[PDB]
């Protein structure tokens, strides 16, 4: 179990850690989060009490270094940093635990939710979508634009998701126009899976990361990426059977975890009605269709 200590909490803020969250009052004696499960990526995220504008946060993996949070009063935000001196870090953390100044990552033992939302997400791939190579952790916020959004404006601050365009020369083989537009298997299997992602695990990893950025930061560009990756699979007549079964599980846990009150903005009615009821895979997502129908029957 690992720890992300905080220097202090000078401003009132709601802090999230994965799917959990808690309020910290201005100058409350808070010094971080302990008992963070090893083996998963994690996200620690922030919403200031005085400006709900800009949710922001940091993707990290404690196996990759010792990380802490420190408020910067010049830039006005809680910043993640790496401590290179391992003995200094251990000594700081141990003092904070002895004084019981940390919240415990509150994982229920039955609960596989975080695993199920991050199964294919790896820090190395996050760091290629979020380019800032001098840090081992990655910053994301509500306003960051994707490369595809920048094509339709700061490139260093972009989310480099894989471009998905259904009316593009990449998607459509000369002479197979109708075939490739109405059945996207070529684009899914040859162009994206074999060509760009190499395997379905990397595809699912980006899909899961896009969903989590949409949910936790309200990142609109990530929402489009998530809906597009889903639609590319559902609009393919030919999909490996293991991929369909895994997609059903992935989406099930995403829909299960989604705040009931964010469904209106985070779920695209056209994509979901198409995927569940018209697409080639309309009958291949049993778990996802059942939870969608019982939780969000309005959308459909």
């Amino acid at each position: 179990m690992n720890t992300v200590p905080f220097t202090s909490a000078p401003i009132e803020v709601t802090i999230g850690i994965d799917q959990y969250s808690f309020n910290v009052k201005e100058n409350q004696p808070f010094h971080g989060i302990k008992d963070i499960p090893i083996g998963h990526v994690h996200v620690i995220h922030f919403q200031h009490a005085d400006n709900s504008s800009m949710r922001y946060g940091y993707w990290f993996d404690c196996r990759m270094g010792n990380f802490y949070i420190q408020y910067d009063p010049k830039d006005g935000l809680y910043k993640m940093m790496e401590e290179r001196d391992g003995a200094k870090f251990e000594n700081i953390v141990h003092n904070f635990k002895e004084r019981q100044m940390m919240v415990s990552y509150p994982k229920i033992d039955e609960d596989d939710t975080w695993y199920n939302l991050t199964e294919f997400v790896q820090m190395d791939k996050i760091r290629k979508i979020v380019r800032k190579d001098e840090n081992q952790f990655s910053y994301v916020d509500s306003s960051m634009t994707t490369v595809q959004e920048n094509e339709l404006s700061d490139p260093a601050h972009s989310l480099n998701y894989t471009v998905i365009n259904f009316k593009s020369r990449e998607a459509i083989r000369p002479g197979h126009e109708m075939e490739d537009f109405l059945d996207k298997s070529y684009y899914l299997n040859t162009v994206m899976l074999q060509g760009i992602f190499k395997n379905s695990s990397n595809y699912f990893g980006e899909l899961q990361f896009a969903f989590l950025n949409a949910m936790f930061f309200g990142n609109y560009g990530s929402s489009l990426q998530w809906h597009a990756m889903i639609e590319l699979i559902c609009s393919s007549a030919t999909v490996p059977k293991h991929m369909l079964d895994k997609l059903d599980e992935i989406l099930y846990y995403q829909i299960k975890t989604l705040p009931e009150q964010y469904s209106d903005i985070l779920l695209n009615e056209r994509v979901w009605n198409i995927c569940l009821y018209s697409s080639f895979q309309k009958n291949s997502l049993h778990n996802t269709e059942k939870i969608m129908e019982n939780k969000y029957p309005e959308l459909l």
Binding site: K167, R169, I172, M178, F181, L182
Partner: protein, 237 residues
């Protein structure tokens, strides 16, 4: 974006543009089978591709053999249309290619856009106008070349005959759409109007009769009466 009554004069500016109408690409005769079921029999069709400024009509005849062994013909017809328009554009010299293609039905947008990915600078546009180009098969000489074709064929016409010698393209298009609207609302009456007087003939190299300016005013008035009338006989007013 969409073409409507507000940007109507744009059709007659000097940017090359084509209208594409696909309503006569897939045509069927519905009939009973010996067993008492219903079947369709396809007949030859055509793509109606028209330069509204010059009157040049690229009539691609769609022979029934193109449907043999194919499924979902209604959907295939839109992609066949788009494939043929794309092939037409590619066959034209660069300086003759259109800058805009306006489709008369919204379901042609994606098929044409996908077939024209190679031409990012050609705008594919819908229209809010209800244009009567379906009635093109009521022009006898066009109907005749379509129904006689034994193979795929492209035939080139000027749908304005020699009118541009005397009138502008705005006026020629207005005349064309009035004639076609009339033929679409009451084909028998419209055709009676156009040919009643045996002394006015259609030149071999034309589609419509050789009306004088004065006779066109008479003709045009008789077509508006027809359209208003039928609108009476239809709605009872």
């Amino acid at each position: 974006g969409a073409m409507n009554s507000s940007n109507y004069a744009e059709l007659f500016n000097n940017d090359i543009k084509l209208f594409v109408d696909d309503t006569n690409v897939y045509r069927v005769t519905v009939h009973k089978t010996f067993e008492g079921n219903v079947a369709t029999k396809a007949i030859n069709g055509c793509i109606f591709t028209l330069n509204p400024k010059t009157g040049h009509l690229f009539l691609k005849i769609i022979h029934t053999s193109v449907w043999a062994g194919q499924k979902r013909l209604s959907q295939l017809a839109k992609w066949k249309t788009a494939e043929e328009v794309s092939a037409l554009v590619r066959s034209l010299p660069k300086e003759e290619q259109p800058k805009q293609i306006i489709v008369t039905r919204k379901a042609m947008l994606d098929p044409l856009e996908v077939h024209m990915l190679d031409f990012p600078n050609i705008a594919i546009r819908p229209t809010e106008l209800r244009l009567p180009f379906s009635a093109a098969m009521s022009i006898d000489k066009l109907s005749d070349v379509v129904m006689k074709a034994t193979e795929p064929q492209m035939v080139l016409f000027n749908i304005y005959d020699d009118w541009l010698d005397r009138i502008s393209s705005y006026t020629a298009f207005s005349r064309l759409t009035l004639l076609l609207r009339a033929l679409k609302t009451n084909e028998e009456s419209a055709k009676m109007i156009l040919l009643s007087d045996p002394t006015i003939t259609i030149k071999s190299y034309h589609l419509w009769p050789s009306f004088t300016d004065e006779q066109w005013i008479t003709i045009e008035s008789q077509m508006r009466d027809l359209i208003l009338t039928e609108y009476g006989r239809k709605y009872n007013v």
